[PDB]
Design a protein around this nucleic acid. Structure first.
Lengths: 56, 84
RNA sequence: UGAAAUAGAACCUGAAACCGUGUGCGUACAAGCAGUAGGAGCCUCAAUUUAUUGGGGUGACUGCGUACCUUUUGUAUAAUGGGUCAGCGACUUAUAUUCUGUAGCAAGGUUAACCGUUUAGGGGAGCCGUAGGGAAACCGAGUCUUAAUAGGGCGUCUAG
RNA sequence: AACCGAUGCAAACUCCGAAUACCGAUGAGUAAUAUCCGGGAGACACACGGCGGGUGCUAACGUCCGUCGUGGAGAGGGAAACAACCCAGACCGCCAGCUAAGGCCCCAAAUUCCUAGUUAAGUGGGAAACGAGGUGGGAAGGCAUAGACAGCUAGGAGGUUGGCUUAGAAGCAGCCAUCCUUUAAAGAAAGCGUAAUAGCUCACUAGUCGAGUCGGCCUGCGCGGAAGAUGUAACGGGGCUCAAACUAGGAGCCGAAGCUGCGGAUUUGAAACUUGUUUUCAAGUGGUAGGGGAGCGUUGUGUAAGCCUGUGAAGGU
RNA sequence: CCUCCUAAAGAGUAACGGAGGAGUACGAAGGUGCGCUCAGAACGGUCGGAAAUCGUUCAUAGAGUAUAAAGGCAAAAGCGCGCUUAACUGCGAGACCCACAAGUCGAGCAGGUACGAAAGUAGGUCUUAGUGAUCCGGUGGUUCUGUAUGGAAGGGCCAUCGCUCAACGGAUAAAAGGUACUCUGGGGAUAACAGGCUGAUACCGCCCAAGAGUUCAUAUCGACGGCGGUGUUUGGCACCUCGAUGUCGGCUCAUCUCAUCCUAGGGCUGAAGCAGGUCCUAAGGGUAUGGCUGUUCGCCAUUUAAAGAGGUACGCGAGC
RNA sequence: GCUGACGACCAUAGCACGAUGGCACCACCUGAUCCCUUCCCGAACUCAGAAGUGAAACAUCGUCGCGCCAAUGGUAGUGUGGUUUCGACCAUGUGAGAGUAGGUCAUCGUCAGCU
């Protein structure tokens, strides 16, 4: 199964790993939505940047 | 310099760093001769498969996987190289 | 007179700074890098069946807006430099060497000075490449260290 | 001194002891990765805002480290104006739309929006110890029609001027007790007063009147404390009081060069008539020092005994 | 150069930050085999005690470890004894650390040993400080070279000696000062003036109330302490200016603040009156001349209702 | 069933107090010719042995007096995002130390010997 993740705030001034958690999901800019597999490994990327992203 | 209470207190020197500590941590692959711990005294003791240098340096005598354990009646910290 | 005379002797052409004259528009209740984005009015040309567009000039009024260079952590800076214009003004040349590209030849490539009836042709002296190891003798895909045939160092199994 | 028991503290104390950080392993997905070799550099004056410290005064737009963000070298919106704060990374064009931070009475785009309260100080819109009977709320309490709190009337006394001390200490300078009696009640006195007494009150009791009242604790928002030099001058201004302030919610909307929409350019990579031969797709395109790539123009040489040019070259405008 | 902390639980990490050590020692204080266990306290005992030596009981180190500190140390790394020279030679897989040059650890192999009955252990010392590149010159060895040839000289290779080259990556074998007689290139990268930030200090105010005030804390003053305001003293910083912002004082001419010197209005008073003392309000006006000294100031003389405290680039030199 | 050797583990295993054990085993024990011992000492080491004894030691058993171990809950701290009057607070994820309830007189392996 998959999930939809959307970036709401910018990830341009974040920590190095928070920047790389956005890029580990495929998110590139604000209001960019990607579909990604729902696994604990990908959900932990969402966890690292939960203030940035929103899971539909 | 009213109250005149100041004055030189010459203690402005120090020594160079020695870069001690654990070099290879537990569960890591190791080859013979690789230094595991650089230390002063035996903070860690050489277990099976680990040698001890004149500097108290602990190094691998043989290849395998480095393992840490607290063993013995003195509750000492031992480092071993398990053949794995 | 001369083709020409705003070619008339300060004489070919006659730029800019700078200074006048004329025409159109704006400007004497409004605060600042003087523009920019809008924008009314006016004036002037070309079409058009006659104020409707289009081009040009001006810019009431509104918003925004503290020159440029240099040097700096940081300049509207009250830090530097420039009054303006025009002209001139600062990474070159010779040789050596290294890397890259390209071209010719290619395990080979190339001549230099010179000669030459001279960019040709000749001239192979020399240079680079094709083997390394070691201070060297020396040996050589090996060689050095060593008592060691062990270990280890440096090399080996093309493109110049 | 120790030794026991309670009780604190320490960078150079530790019986203990995280979170993170770091070093590894395994595993997905996403990603213009990591590493090595060579050509060319620039830089080795950094700054601020957080966080952990040393120094300083837990002073400095101070200084020295570590660590993160921003500036440097970064425009746009917000903070009135404001390199370093917040939001957000400008390829170009549009008189399109949605939002971020911040905002919505007027200057000035968008709510004189809705609900429940608080403030009366223009607090909001500088400043503390400390003070006060501001005001709201919350947990409890003491007393009360066996008349509560306040007021008014009457008493508030006798041993005794307690003992001591002291010049004096007589309830009331100070030290040691808080005793007894008539009691409805009256302290060996809570104040004023006297040199000491005297004197006036109070505590306390009874009476009058008649209904609630008294004092602490905690919480919110206020008050005073609060004096400076060119001019209001400590909301940017106007102005604002069932707010246009504050608290807690809710719904709209404005709001950027962010995102989307439309058109166009461009770098890199990707399936091919294949060297820009063509259609696309994907990810990009702020930028100083600096590195890489592609071009424009000028003078001169060959092309050129060409081509153009008095039917007008160069130059000027 | 070493040790601890700063140093933010891997490493590293600065300050003219807080504390200490080193520039050695040892042929045994190294190696090995064997053996041993300390500091203290109490009790008993001639001199003899608080403590010498002896005996007994507790006693994981409260001792020792050559040398500071840290980390270690019972298989003792601590303490003795016998024999010894591994304080070897050629090396070294592999690592740590590291800009380089350096530095650190190292099993294993070969040769020759030392100790042990042997398995074994030993390439100095519990470790981390005890150090100095290259050049040059000296010495012990060596077939490497040897300018016609044989030699030799000289050189090379291996080993080793000569540094407070201590400014310790060492500029030369060899080195002090003055300049107000000065000069050039630069810097607001960096001081002196003034501004800015800050407010330790200063000044002013408030809180508490021990006391002084014959009595009586609060008329007046305010010990010990606490909290602020100002920018106002003495300072701190180095942000602006070094392709120039003229220093103090005087003169002239000012402008503002109020923490008010006079005058005005008040409360309290240890306010009889007259005079005051404090505190509140109040900035409209006013608020000297001289002697001394460059002085601002300050002392003094004589006045005045009073002779204010301050800001203004410690106002004012393109005004003197 | 118990004893001894060597290990695992290293206090929930230790300390303390009491009790039990001598057929084997162990320990004290006898003696010092011999090997070997003492900077003196047959104390320790070493040998030759079996009269005595489980007194000591040792082993085993018992207990909570000490020591040790130790929750649950809460608190402190803390990564990330936000806010702040700079003390802290909110969201999320972690989460001690101390202390309390409580637990504890260990638990196993190989071999040999008596039963």
């Amino acid at each position: 199964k998959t999930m939809k993740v959307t970036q709401l705030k910018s990830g341009a001034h974040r920590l190095k790993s928070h920047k790389a958690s956005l890029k580990g999901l495929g998110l590139r800019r604000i209001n960019h939505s990607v579909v990604v597999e729902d696994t604990p490994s990908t959900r932990g990327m969402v966890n690292r940047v939960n203030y940035l992203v929103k899971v539909e | 310099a009213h109250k005149k209470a100041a004055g030189s207190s010459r203690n402005g020197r120090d020594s160079n760093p020695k870069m001690l500590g654990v070099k290879i941590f537990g569960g890591q692959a190791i080859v013979a001769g690789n230094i595991i711990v650089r230390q002063r005294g035996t903070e860690f003791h050489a277990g099976a498969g680990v040698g001890m240098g004149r500097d108290h340096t602990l190094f691998a005598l043989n290849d395998g996987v480095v393992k840490f354990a607290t063993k013995g009646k003195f509750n000492r910290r031992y480092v071993m190289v398990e053949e794995a």
